[PDB]
């Protein structure tokens, strides 16, 4: 006898919006009913703040960044290495009936027979009699797209929840629109609970409850402004409930059997989900998985509550790029902004379809926000450190305070070690990485592990007093390796005017680098620091780029310059660059259209 | 000097999908630019809810139903009477250069030299120097076929418009597929605007804008489920924008000159389009036309806004028959269902290629719909009455409420007089009508005007209490005229069990009526009300039918029994009997493929 599994997944939502975790959240009788014989997790987190990279993590039990899958949505899907597959593939091979309804959003090439059925209406019903099953289902009721309503809805559509009772995130302006948007999101939670009840009630009528582990969770944090798309805790924290079936209690430690509703405070990550299903199904862990099962025969509640670690990743989201790593350990959250000159408010078309987003930015421009509220739109610190017990909304950066020097240094080392040993493939720009790594990222990883260690050491030079690293950094700017010149230029950008001594070197890179992104970075530096007008050269370079991703990278730089210097760009693209193939081209073209329409006007 | 005309026609689309009419509609900057110096009509309607009969109407300025042209697509095209022709023909004869690109879809036989040129790429560029022109062009971007995408598109192809903000029609279930489909249709509107912009910009660059009336409109309402193919307002309402040329403002009443952007609220019908062009060209109205110009020297905006009448017609769409008439007057909409035992959801192959259609039907069968949403699939009332001001989506049938008795009675009378006086030839079944009327429908009409009054009076006996009409009805059941027996049987079918006293007469019609459709009606009645198996009998009558339309009509009865009682039919056709051939064959394959299974 093997247990069944059900994954009930709502889109984009954090735990604060649920009454189960928050006194001013939405009542959800069906999910609250699950919790009655269930484990309720107070600290479950994805490892990235958007759908495709989070879903990818869930399936694989492994970090996307080490497999060249950190790019939403992908330009190239990546072929999986031999010793790593999806949990649906593993369960299917082991004889489970596996149904998915219907979202996938994988950044890997799908394994053959990945599911018994992945489509609208796919169901455990279609299993063979007595066959154990794994059902996954997505509800889009809470998706970001549901908060793209017109501002006039404030007066035209009433919310069930009362916006006047809303207690806003500290980084948000206290406005009617924001309190309204919040209430709309509370309303969507009431709704999705109803919809999910349909499925839970079928399992009940069919008598499957006590043979089945039922998981409910959000597919990442969100979705009010400053959450989804960022590795702040807002982007990562999700509700998580596991109703523990009576007939398979014996697979778990007595502490975890959920004979009464039980709270778990240990940090659970999305990398842990697949290893957990493997263990419960009696299957061995994948030799390339990063996560660890949180449901084991020998795992006590105390054991589980000691877990306190989560690494988070953010790179590309639609047309918009930035590079941020998050590292939470115990009560501290450490943030590394590798490209601090990119504000978090750097324009993304889809984010700003939410009217609250537009209002926030408008209020920033009008100088009506306090320092905590306006930080989202400004140049970032190279490092941020937060005490989540004292400051759960990450509003007070401790990194520059002398009494936290040791804490900063240690978490700095912890993150560098993690990213170097993984190794984090995203220190190669996507426009170089994915075309090569797509055949087998493990192969790329093995070949270039030390290169990535070098890239990380180069950029982290910007964490040192300029006088101590200037000679080292100068030599890197003159390196033969183009991606080392890239990361040295990025260090130079972090230094700002402190590195102005490098001007002739920077000017030469601007004129003559064989790499177009390296030219663009130098132009960026000179535009930001020395009054150079970048429009003409960047317009040319975008036109010169011989592949979509290189152009897109340069368009992101144009966007940063547009947002900071308030200048327009006129973009034309290089003429040089099957139903499913159509879909890919449409998505890519959308990215460029989004950039072109935006950059056109100040 | 005479004005030019351009007709820019998008296919299958209603007004709610344009920003111009609806806050959640698609932006269409080129169309919207016509409005800048134009008239925007808020209540333009076709007189029928599908391409060929609506196209026919546009061209003739006259009701297809009075000309045996009410069938889509036509089995038999109808020759025009001497005093009625197309606007393209009338204009050509007056010296205009007429071009059509390129969709015709006419239910009449085309006049000789109907167009100066009618083909792909035909253009006003080929006119003689100085020659006034009429250019018609059709875009298929918004055609129904574009919504026949697979349900998997929801995951694979994201829409440009946001489907989450869509405010769905009340008869629709509020599902992801329906909102996604809606968003897809919005996308096609943004696309078709770009396409029409090409022709508008040519007219601009050539300096023809101020000598040319430019009309933009849809060729009937649609095209989400419940619209195209039905005479609810969904099937009929279309956008209509007319850019008024500076140099021919003198032809118009000051109110209509669009010196400022102007909204017109009066009801404009498709029969009105041809008379409008004749007047603007300085030509007389045809003596057989039904419409009246809405652009004129002496017509003020108030006079135009007083118009509030639309008559609408539904008979055959591909393989599916049903007979419905709509009568809109002022704030009221009246619907007469002559064959109320045919649910609107009666199967049609092309309709149900739209995924949203199949989901709707599935949710109906799963009993997951409310009563507003599920009426589409149910037996119809014989009459419906809707207050379009309080209830613009026609969801609350007022017709049985006592306080609306007089309104029902008056509009019933208004409709009856209209259909008798036209006269409406479709009270003759198509299988009999078109073979005979194809030579000249006006002569058929003259010969048989009283016969049609009688048919209308026969079927309308089903509006009375049974006891009050049973004697009269029985007599018609025993009439010597086959089509009176036909309409008497349709009356009996509407009365259902209330008429069971006629059982012997009905069983006799089943055994012995010379008319095979009459037998099939009796078999239909006996199956629905007496549990008598129709399967064998209808298989044999279809096989026995000596002409395609008779077989097709009997197959429709089989479809109604299939959908209502769950009965399968194994269909064989009579051995006795190019676009035409493919189209007819298509009808029968669709019926044969569908009936075979439950
Ligand atoms: Ca999501
Ligand atoms: Ca059409
Ligand atoms: Cl610790
Ligand atoms: Cl005669
Ligand atoms: Cl007569």
Short mmCIF file of C-alpha atoms in Angstrom, two decimals, chain A residues 257-562:
data_model
loop_
_atom_site.label_atom_id
_atom_site.label_comp_id
_atom_site.label_asym_id
_atom_site.label_seq_id
_atom_site.Cartn_x
_atom_site.Cartn_y
_atom_site.Cartn_z
CA UNK A 257 1.01 12.69 12.41
CA UNK A 258 -1.40 15.63 12.88
CA UNK A 259 -3.93 13.87 15.12
CA UNK A 260 -4.69 17.47 16.08
CA UNK A 261 -3.83 20.49 13.90
CA UNK A 262 -0.11 21.07 14.37
CA UNK A 263 1.98 24.17 13.68
CA UNK A 264 5.47 23.81 12.15
CA UNK A 265 7.86 26.75 12.45
CA UNK A 266 10.95 25.31 10.72
CA UNK A 267 11.81 26.85 7.33
CA UNK A 268 10.55 24.71 4.45
CA UNK A 269 11.81 25.47 0.92
CA UNK A 270 10.41 24.56 -2.49
CA UNK A 271 13.56 22.46 -3.14
CA UNK A 272 12.31 20.15 -0.38
CA UNK A 273 8.95 19.27 -1.91
CA UNK A 274 10.05 16.63 -4.43
CA UNK A 275 12.43 14.81 -1.99
CA UNK A 276 9.45 14.63 0.41
CA UNK A 277 7.14 12.85 -2.08
CA UNK A 278 9.99 10.51 -3.02
CA UNK A 279 10.53 9.45 0.60
CA UNK A 280 6.80 8.98 1.28
CA UNK A 281 6.49 6.88 -1.88
CA UNK A 282 9.39 4.72 -0.67
CA UNK A 283 11.71 6.01 -3.42
CA UNK A 284 15.38 7.04 -3.04
CA UNK A 285 16.37 10.69 -3.36
CA UNK A 286 17.78 11.93 -6.70
CA UNK A 287 21.60 12.11 -6.62
CA UNK A 288 21.38 15.67 -7.95
CA UNK A 289 18.62 17.06 -5.71
CA UNK A 290 19.34 19.95 -3.38
CA UNK A 291 16.36 19.65 -1.02
CA UNK A 292 15.60 17.42 1.96
CA UNK A 293 12.34 15.70 2.83
CA UNK A 294 10.40 17.27 5.69
CA UNK A 295 8.14 14.26 6.27
CA UNK A 296 10.10 11.31 7.60
CA UNK A 297 9.64 8.45 10.03
CA UNK A 298 12.57 9.71 12.13
CA UNK A 299 12.00 13.47 11.87
CA UNK A 300 10.56 15.01 15.05
CA UNK A 301 8.88 18.40 15.28
CA UNK A 302 11.91 19.75 17.16
CA UNK A 303 14.16 18.40 14.41
CA UNK A 304 11.99 20.11 11.83
CA UNK A 305 11.83 23.37 13.75
CA UNK A 306 15.63 23.72 13.74
CA UNK A 307 15.65 24.10 9.94
CA UNK A 308 16.08 27.84 9.32
CA UNK A 309 17.69 28.31 5.88
CA UNK A 310 16.46 29.56 2.52
CA UNK A 311 18.41 30.66 -0.56
CA UNK A 312 16.53 32.73 -3.11
CA UNK A 313 17.15 33.72 -6.69
CA UNK A 314 16.03 36.48 -9.10
CA UNK A 315 17.26 37.11 -12.62
CA UNK A 316 15.02 37.78 -15.64
CA UNK A 317 11.25 38.43 -15.47
CA UNK A 318 9.63 38.84 -18.89
CA UNK A 319 11.64 41.67 -20.54
CA UNK A 320 13.20 42.90 -17.30
CA UNK A 321 16.56 41.81 -15.91
CA UNK A 322 18.30 42.27 -12.56
CA UNK A 323 20.54 40.05 -10.45
CA UNK A 324 19.71 39.53 -6.81
CA UNK A 325 20.43 36.72 -4.34
CA UNK A 326 18.66 36.29 -1.00
CA UNK A 327 20.04 34.36 1.99
CA UNK A 328 17.93 33.87 5.11
CA UNK A 329 19.52 32.07 8.10
CA UNK A 330 17.91 32.02 11.55
CA UNK A 331 16.51 35.44 12.34
CA UNK A 332 18.58 37.28 9.70
CA UNK A 333 17.88 37.97 6.04
CA UNK A 334 20.84 38.92 3.87
CA UNK A 335 20.36 40.41 0.39
CA UNK A 336 23.08 40.76 -2.26
CA UNK A 337 22.43 43.25 -5.05
CA UNK A 338 25.02 42.47 -7.72
CA UNK A 339 23.76 45.30 -9.95
CA UNK A 340 22.70 47.92 -7.34
CA UNK A 341 22.26 50.65 -9.98
CA UNK A 342 19.09 48.77 -11.09
CA UNK A 343 16.27 49.98 -8.76
CA UNK A 344 13.65 47.35 -7.99
CA UNK A 345 11.11 49.65 -9.70
CA UNK A 346 13.01 49.29 -13.01
CA UNK A 347 10.17 49.16 -15.51
CA UNK A 348 8.40 45.90 -16.27
CA UNK A 349 5.27 46.11 -18.48
CA UNK A 350 3.27 43.45 -16.66
CA UNK A 351 4.02 44.66 -13.09
CA UNK A 352 2.79 48.15 -13.97
CA UNK A 353 -0.54 46.84 -15.29
CA UNK A 354 -1.47 46.92 -11.58
CA UNK A 355 -2.79 50.42 -10.85
CA UNK A 356 -1.32 50.40 -7.34
CA UNK A 357 2.08 49.93 -8.99
CA UNK A 358 1.51 53.01 -11.15
CA UNK A 359 0.23 55.04 -8.20
CA UNK A 360 3.26 54.06 -6.10
CA UNK A 361 5.67 55.22 -8.79
CA UNK A 362 3.71 58.43 -9.39
CA UNK A 363 3.81 59.23 -5.65
CA UNK A 364 7.56 58.51 -5.65
CA UNK A 365 8.09 60.98 -8.52
CA UNK A 366 5.96 63.59 -6.73
CA UNK A 367 8.11 63.28 -3.58
CA UNK A 368 5.21 62.12 -1.45
CA UNK A 369 6.70 58.88 -0.06
CA UNK A 370 8.67 58.34 3.15
CA UNK A 371 12.12 56.74 3.02
CA UNK A 372 10.85 53.22 3.65
CA UNK A 373 8.17 53.56 1.01
CA UNK A 374 10.44 55.09 -1.62
CA UNK A 375 13.33 52.59 -1.35
CA UNK A 376 11.82 50.27 -3.99
CA UNK A 377 12.43 53.00 -6.64
CA UNK A 378 16.00 53.99 -5.70
CA UNK A 379 19.56 52.77 -6.23
CA UNK A 380 20.13 49.78 -3.95
CA UNK A 381 22.79 49.09 -1.29
CA UNK A 382 25.33 46.44 -2.38
CA UNK A 383 24.27 44.40 0.67
CA UNK A 384 21.20 44.49 2.89
CA UNK A 385 20.81 42.81 6.30
CA UNK A 386 17.54 42.49 8.22
CA UNK A 387 16.52 41.17 11.63
CA UNK A 388 13.25 39.37 10.72
CA UNK A 389 12.23 39.02 14.39
CA UNK A 390 12.45 42.76 14.98
CA UNK A 391 11.83 43.84 11.40
CA UNK A 392 9.81 41.22 9.48
CA UNK A 393 9.05 43.63 6.62
CA UNK A 394 12.76 44.17 5.92
CA UNK A 395 12.58 48.00 6.35
CA UNK A 396 15.77 48.77 8.29
CA UNK A 397 19.08 47.78 6.64
CA UNK A 398 21.61 46.89 9.31
CA UNK A 399 24.49 46.16 6.95
CA UNK A 400 26.24 49.51 7.43
CA UNK A 401 25.90 49.58 11.22
CA UNK A 402 29.26 48.75 12.85
CA UNK A 403 27.79 46.39 15.46
CA UNK A 404 26.54 44.13 12.66
CA UNK A 405 29.89 43.99 10.78
CA UNK A 406 30.60 40.39 11.82
CA UNK A 407 27.08 39.22 10.96
CA UNK A 408 27.38 40.85 7.53
CA UNK A 409 30.83 39.33 6.89
CA UNK A 410 29.67 35.83 7.85
CA UNK A 411 26.49 35.82 5.77
CA UNK A 412 28.47 37.34 2.93
CA UNK A 413 30.83 34.33 3.13
CA UNK A 414 27.95 31.88 3.45
CA UNK A 415 26.29 33.14 0.27
CA UNK A 416 29.58 33.23 -1.71
CA UNK A 417 30.28 29.65 -0.66
CA UNK A 418 26.77 28.51 -1.62
CA UNK A 419 26.80 30.16 -5.04
CA UNK A 420 30.38 29.02 -5.82
CA UNK A 421 29.79 25.40 -4.82
CA UNK A 422 26.37 24.99 -6.53
CA UNK A 423 27.72 26.58 -8.83
CA UNK A 424 25.30 29.40 -9.73
CA UNK A 425 25.33 29.40 -13.54
CA UNK A 426 23.61 32.78 -13.79
CA UNK A 427 26.90 34.66 -13.40
CA UNK A 428 27.09 33.97 -17.10
CA UNK A 429 24.71 36.28 -18.92
CA UNK A 430 21.74 34.38 -20.31
CA UNK A 431 22.60 35.47 -23.85
CA UNK A 432 25.77 33.34 -23.56
CA UNK A 433 24.62 30.67 -21.10
CA UNK A 434 21.47 29.01 -22.29
CA UNK A 435 22.47 28.35 -25.90
CA UNK A 436 25.45 26.31 -24.72
CA UNK A 437 24.07 24.86 -21.47
CA UNK A 438 20.75 23.68 -22.98
CA UNK A 439 22.21 20.32 -24.06
CA UNK A 440 23.16 19.39 -20.47
CA UNK A 441 23.79 22.09 -17.82
CA UNK A 442 25.69 19.65 -15.61
CA UNK A 443 28.27 19.43 -18.40
CA UNK A 444 28.49 23.24 -18.63
CA UNK A 445 28.60 23.45 -14.83
CA UNK A 446 31.51 21.00 -14.54
CA UNK A 447 33.48 22.80 -17.27
CA UNK A 448 33.05 26.30 -15.87
CA UNK A 449 32.88 25.96 -12.12
CA UNK A 450 36.08 27.92 -11.49
CA UNK A 451 35.05 30.62 -14.03
CA UNK A 452 31.95 31.31 -11.91
CA UNK A 453 34.09 31.39 -8.75
CA UNK A 454 36.18 34.05 -10.52
CA UNK A 455 33.12 36.08 -11.62
CA UNK A 456 31.82 36.12 -8.04
CA UNK A 457 35.23 37.21 -6.69
CA UNK A 458 35.44 39.95 -9.33
CA UNK A 459 32.05 41.53 -8.58
CA UNK A 460 32.57 41.23 -4.81
CA UNK A 461 35.62 43.46 -5.12
CA UNK A 462 33.02 46.26 -5.05
CA UNK A 463 32.46 45.31 -1.38
CA UNK A 464 36.01 46.48 -0.53
CA UNK A 465 37.52 49.97 -0.13
CA UNK A 466 38.37 51.11 -3.65
CA UNK A 467 42.02 51.82 -2.86
CA UNK A 468 42.59 48.23 -1.73
CA UNK A 469 41.24 46.63 -4.93
CA UNK A 470 41.92 49.21 -7.65
CA UNK A 471 44.96 47.47 -9.10
CA UNK A 472 43.26 44.07 -9.10
CA UNK A 473 40.16 45.56 -10.72
CA UNK A 474 42.16 47.43 -13.36
CA UNK A 475 43.85 44.21 -14.48
CA UNK A 476 40.46 42.51 -14.77
CA UNK A 477 39.16 45.37 -16.95
CA UNK A 478 42.11 44.59 -19.26
CA UNK A 479 41.46 40.82 -19.19
CA UNK A 480 41.20 38.77 -22.39
CA UNK A 481 38.11 36.99 -21.03
CA UNK A 482 35.08 39.03 -22.11
CA UNK A 483 32.87 37.99 -19.22
CA UNK A 484 35.56 38.97 -16.74
CA UNK A 485 35.62 42.46 -18.31
CA UNK A 486 31.85 42.40 -17.94
CA UNK A 487 31.92 41.68 -14.20
CA UNK A 488 34.75 44.18 -13.66
CA UNK A 489 32.71 46.83 -15.43
CA UNK A 490 29.78 45.91 -13.14
CA UNK A 491 32.07 46.36 -10.15
CA UNK A 492 33.11 49.73 -11.56
CA UNK A 493 29.41 50.70 -11.85
CA UNK A 494 28.86 49.75 -8.19
CA UNK A 495 31.78 52.01 -7.28
CA UNK A 496 30.28 54.96 -9.19
CA UNK A 497 32.46 58.10 -9.13
CA UNK A 498 34.85 56.39 -6.70
CA UNK A 499 36.31 54.59 -9.71
CA UNK A 500 36.58 57.70 -11.94
CA UNK A 501 40.34 57.14 -12.22
CA UNK A 502 39.50 54.29 -14.65
CA UNK A 503 37.93 56.75 -17.13
CA UNK A 504 40.40 56.19 -20.02
CA UNK A 505 40.02 52.43 -19.61
CA UNK A 506 36.25 52.75 -19.52
CA UNK A 507 36.31 55.02 -22.58
CA UNK A 508 38.40 52.45 -24.50
CA UNK A 509 35.93 49.65 -23.58
CA UNK A 510 33.13 51.91 -24.80
CA UNK A 511 34.80 52.38 -28.20
CA UNK A 512 36.39 49.03 -28.86
CA UNK A 513 35.17 46.08 -26.84
CA UNK A 514 34.34 43.14 -29.11
CA UNK A 515 31.49 42.41 -26.69
CA UNK A 516 28.44 44.63 -27.19
CA UNK A 517 27.22 44.27 -23.61
CA UNK A 518 30.65 45.40 -22.37
CA UNK A 519 30.41 48.52 -24.54
CA UNK A 520 26.91 49.16 -23.20
CA UNK A 521 28.07 48.90 -19.58
CA UNK A 522 30.86 51.43 -20.19
CA UNK A 523 28.36 53.76 -21.88
CA UNK A 524 26.04 53.22 -18.92
CA UNK A 525 28.83 54.19 -16.48
CA UNK A 526 29.77 57.29 -18.50
CA UNK A 527 26.13 58.33 -18.88
CA UNK A 528 25.43 57.90 -15.16
CA UNK A 529 28.67 59.43 -13.90
CA UNK A 530 30.17 61.70 -16.52
CA UNK A 531 27.29 63.25 -18.44
CA UNK A 532 27.64 61.24 -21.65
CA UNK A 533 24.43 61.09 -23.67
CA UNK A 534 23.89 57.36 -24.39
CA UNK A 535 20.92 57.43 -26.78
CA UNK A 536 22.66 57.25 -30.14
CA UNK A 537 25.25 54.61 -29.24
CA UNK A 538 22.79 52.29 -27.46
CA UNK A 539 20.25 52.66 -30.27
CA UNK A 540 23.05 51.53 -32.62
CA UNK A 541 24.25 48.66 -30.42
CA UNK A 542 20.73 47.29 -30.03
CA UNK A 543 20.50 47.31 -33.82
CA UNK A 544 23.93 45.62 -34.09
CA UNK A 545 23.11 42.71 -31.74
CA UNK A 546 23.06 39.43 -33.67
CA UNK A 547 20.75 37.53 -31.31
CA UNK A 548 17.55 38.35 -29.36
CA UNK A 549 18.97 37.94 -25.83
CA UNK A 550 21.97 40.23 -26.43
CA UNK A 551 19.60 42.94 -27.74
CA UNK A 552 17.29 42.41 -24.77
CA UNK A 553 20.21 42.76 -22.33
CA UNK A 554 21.14 46.04 -23.98
CA UNK A 555 17.48 47.14 -23.88
CA UNK A 556 17.50 46.57 -20.13
CA UNK A 557 20.45 48.94 -19.80
CA UNK A 558 18.54 51.48 -21.90
CA UNK A 559 15.63 51.10 -19.48
CA UNK A 560 17.82 51.78 -16.43
CA UNK A 561 19.21 54.88 -18.16
CA UNK A 562 15.68 55.96 -19.25
#
